Amino acid sequence: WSAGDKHKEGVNSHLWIVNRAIDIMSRNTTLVKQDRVAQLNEWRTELENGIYAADYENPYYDNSTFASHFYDPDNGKTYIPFAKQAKETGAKYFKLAGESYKNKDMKQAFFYLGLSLHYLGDVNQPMHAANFTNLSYPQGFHSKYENFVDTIKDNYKVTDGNGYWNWKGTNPEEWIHGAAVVAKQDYSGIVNDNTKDWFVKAAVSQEYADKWRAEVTPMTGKRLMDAQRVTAGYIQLWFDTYGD
């Protein structure tokens, strides 16, 4: 997903996803200790810096190839042979964040948490869970799709307190893998012969530009909502694990 501005949701789908996940935690009055949301807000600048940094600098964006931002659950690889993927990378920052949290280094802790949340968010994007890049056929579709998402994302907010609490085990890799599995199952709802043909025709036809956008909207909504619920459960796991 996009992460265009450090502290604005406008063209930053990643931040939007995290903010909506936090809202789910706030809405829950049965099992969530609200002081956890207070801490995320206290160190929000750092959390957002981490969410943004993943797509802007090394080592996070791998020399502008973004290889660590992809993860196919069926073969466990990213799109570049031998490169690090999103599962191991997301888990890495989940643990670094937690160790810093226990050591009372809050800025370090929430910066790393933000990075981890970014990688978890990415595997929820079907293209990232299936190694479909902006160079994949049809080339240019990946970037156009993620920019389009920003124009409609705010219409798919989860409005209840039902995050996926204890969705997977205590291992963050299990959560990232699990999210990638669902995202890949949903891949054909975004990338198929129809959306491919229409995207290409959109080059010279406004009608087809609107056609592929409409076609991918329902599944986009599903992916954004699942992303919110999974992220909420993931944050809860982090505090349950490292929260004193």
Binding of Zn ion by 77 (CB under 5 A): no
Please state, in angstroms and rounded to a whole number, the distance separating the CA atoms of residues 34 and 154: 24
The active-site residue, picked from 46, 48, 128, 177, is: 128
Binding of Zn ion by 69 (CB under 5 A): yes
Question: Would you say 22 and 10 are in contact if contact means Cβ atoms under 8 Å apart?
Answer: no
Binding of Zn ion by 1 (CB under 5 A): yes
Helix (H, G, I), strand (E, B) or coil at 107: helix
Of the ranges 80-88, 115-123, 153-161, 219-227, which one interacts with Zn ion (CB under 5 A)?
115-123
User: Does 7 participate in catalysis according to the annotation?
Assistant: no
Q: Token pair for residue 83? A: 């490169």
**Contact with Zn ion (CB under 5 A) among 55, 111, 156, 168:** 55
The active-site residue, picked from 14, 46, 48, 72, is: 14
Distance from CA of residue 56 to its chain's centroid? 15
Per-state percent for the chain, helix, strand, coil, to nearest 5: 60, 0, 35
Q: Token pair for residue 122? A: 């990415």
The active-site residue, picked from 72, 118, 177, 186, is: 118
**Contact with Zn ion (CB under 5 A) among 23, 48, 72, 122:** 122
User: Does 118 participate in catalysis according to the annotation?
Assistant: yes
Amino acid letter at 180?
Answer: A
Binding of Zn ion by 199 (CB under 5 A): no
Binding of Zn ion by 141 (CB under 5 A): no
Cβ distance to Zn ion smaller for residue 89 or 100: 89
142 is in an annotated binding site: yes
Distance from CA of residue 202 to its chain's centroid? 28
1 is in an annotated binding site: yes
Q: Largest Cα–Cα distance of the chain, in whole Å?
A: 59
Q: Which residues contact 4 (CB under 8 A, 6 or more apart)?
A: 10, 11, 12, 150
Cβ distance to Zn ion smaller for residue 48 or 55: 55
CB of 212 to Zn ion, least distance (A): 17
Q: Which residues contact 57 (CB under 8 A, 6 or more apart)?
A: none
Cβ distance to Zn ion smaller for residue 161 or 189: 189
CB of 41 to Zn ion, least distance (A): 23
User: Does 69 participate in catalysis according to the annotation?
Assistant: yes
Q: What is the DSSP letter of 213?
A: H
Q: Give the residue numbers marked as catalytic.
A: 14, 55, 69, 118, 122, 128, 142, 146
Residue ranges in contact with Zn ion by CB under 5 A = 1, 55, 69, 122
